[PDB]
RNA sequence: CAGCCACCCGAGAUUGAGCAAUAACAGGUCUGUGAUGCCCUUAGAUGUCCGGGGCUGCACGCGCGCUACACUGACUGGCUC
């Protein structure tokens, strides 16, 4: 194992390259499904429980994914699937470590998923004042709270929209993304291929996410994303009650979640922005009562524009794209050997490691 | 503990008044009284009636108010409590 590139969050704070044209499209694929306004309008004092739905996992690297593999080698040299540039676009916000694999084989610069002491699962309360103890195998332990959080954004995603109704079919099918056998539990989740200019052959073939579509008040296609939070043990991290405040002081709840979860919200915001979706839907999920997991209730959903909300997470897309360009610059000197980008967990500085003999 | 804050359900989670202590004030009223002490006046009456005048007088200084200075308006018509 070799050490190649190391940079702190301070350098990323002052890195910028505002060269992002209006994005084009390459191909859009994946059947969509409508939503229910009654499930949206569920509010505090009018509860509704959270059941379990079956999520067909569709996380795959670009190379193995057949739709990308029949388009990556044809044109373009810089490639990055969805929710993967957020790692490089949330460096100054993150405090933990993530792992990703950028392979500079020839002129190709395609990102891929890799695991080295960290996973892709949701991270909760990572950068908060007075962080949670996370000791042993407690209810608030990191892997188990993360597993609970991933449970929620897998189930409620498939519990807010009218899944049982006839799914609208886009013209192109999603090849090999849960298409080998029609399990009939294939969700509304569609994927777009879009290309935009950022620099030296950085026409980025990029996958997108659409967690559903919502019919307009006048009636037309309007894509949406469905992602949700989770409440637990309000005394910790200087929390606030959602069952008493969501109806009339929801702004404070958003404020304290932004204060508590910053890396996570930026991670979501990146995805919701690059997908070009119309509405971002944030569901509010809380435990039945304190100190009791495996039971949750959906306390409401809020609609905000993915761009306006990007302005309200004090995130600049300019410096984000610039730190992306600068990490590609730091990954331009490297060679055919791939690079596992493992940051330093205890002291947050970005790092990467060239893989010996193609280490995976 | 007396209590306080928020919320649910509720017509309503502080409706508004009347009455209102012990002590006082040289507070106001003798111009409310066939309530009243004392003093004054009592046939050219300060009783009472009639006629006329005045309270309203006008260089000025205050107090309670009404109408305004406009176009978020005035005028004309219509319609509705
Ligand atoms: Mg006196
Ligand atoms: Mg008297
Ligand atoms: Mg007379
Ligand atoms: Mg007078
Ligand atoms: Mg007066
Ligand atoms: Mg006039």
UniProtKB/Swiss-Prot annotation:
The record's subcellular locations are: Cytoplasm
Q: Where is this region: RNA gate?
A: 118-132
Q: Which GO terms describe its molecular function?
A: mRNA cap binding; RNA binding; translation initiation factor activity
This protein's UniProt keywords: Acetylation, Cytoplasm, Host-virus interaction, Initiation factor, Phosphoprotein, Protein biosynthesis, RNA-binding
Q: What biological-process terms (Gene Ontology) are attached?
A: cap-dependent translational initiation; formation of cytoplasmic translation initiation complex; IRES-dependent viral translational initiation; translational initiation; viral translational termination-reinitiation
Q: Identify one Gene Ontology CC term for this UniProt entry.
A: eukaryotic 43S preinitiation complex
Chief place of localization: cytoplasm
Q: What does its UniProt record remark on the domains?
A: The RNA gate region regulates mRNA cap recognition to prevent promiscuous mRNA-binding before assembly of EIF3D into the full eukaryotic translation initiation factor 3 (eIF-3) complex.
**What is the annotated quaternary arrangement, including any partners?**
Component of the eukaryotic translation initiation factor 3 (eIF-3) complex, which is composed of 13 subunits: EIF3A, EIF3B, EIF3C, EIF3D, EIF3E, EIF3F, EIF3G, EIF3H, EIF3I, EIF3J, EIF3K, EIF3L and EIF3M. The eIF-3 complex appears to include 3 stable modules: module A is composed of EIF3A, EIF3B, EIF3G and EIF3I; module B is composed of EIF3F, EIF3H, and EIF3M; and module C is composed of EIF3C, EIF3D, EIF3E, EIF3K and EIF3L. EIF3C of module C binds EIF3B of module A and EIF3H of module B, thereby linking the three modules. EIF3J is a labile subunit that binds to the eIF-3 complex via EIF3B. (Microbial infection) Interacts with Norwalk virus VPg protein.
**Per its UniProt record, which disorder involves this protein?**
Defects in EIF3D are associated with some cancers, such as prostate, breast and colon cancers. Disease susceptibility may be associated with variants affecting the gene represented in this entry. Down-regulation inhibits proliferation of cancers.
Described purpose of this protein according to its UniProt entry: mRNA cap-binding component of the eukaryotic translation initiation factor 3 (eIF-3) complex, a complex required for several steps in the initiation of protein synthesis of a specialized repertoire of mRNAs. The eIF-3 complex associates with the 40S ribosome and facilitates the recruitment of eIF-1, eIF-1A, eIF-2:GTP:methionyl-tRNAi and eIF-5 to form the 43S pre-initiation complex (43S PIC). The eIF-3 complex stimulates mRNA recruitment to the 43S PIC and scanning of the mRNA for AUG recognition. (Microbial infection) In case of FCV infection, plays a role in the ribosomal termination-reinitiation event leading to the translation of VP2.
Per the record, the similarity remark reads: Belongs to the eIF-3 subunit D family.
Protein name per Swiss-Prot or TrEMBL = Eukaryotic translation initiation factor 3 subunit D
Q: Which organism is it from?
A: Homo sapiens (Human)
Q: Gene encoding it?
A: EIF3D
